[PDB]
């Protein structure tokens, strides 16, 4: 049974690190769509304060 | 010794369960500002002509 619950243990260990690790490519991957997002809102920001400039212009 | 192995695997299935939580907390966190990002870089860009517009007019 401990060696079936080492074995599950350990497939908790590998499922979970598994898992995180899926995490952390998925978090790299929002976290980069993210940075991709923000960095293309802030280009847009960026533009609507070049447009705010040449409004107040 | 199986036990103690299984409670370390255990412990990892919980720091990597913890780690699983905290990314996912993290990948949730992230992907809401993701979203909350697409919907900025989306409104950003809405307003990239809104502006663009405001310059044309």
Sequence with gaps: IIESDL???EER???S????????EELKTV???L???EA???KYSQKEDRY???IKV
């Design 31 to 33: 976290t980069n769509n």
């Design 52 to 54: 705010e400039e040449e």
């Design 40 to 42: 293309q809102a802030e």
């Design 7 to 9: 074995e599950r243990a």
């Design 35 to 37: 940075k991709s997002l």
């Design 13 to 15: 260990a590998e499922l």
């Design 17 to 24: 690190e598994g898992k995180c690790a899926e995490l952390e």
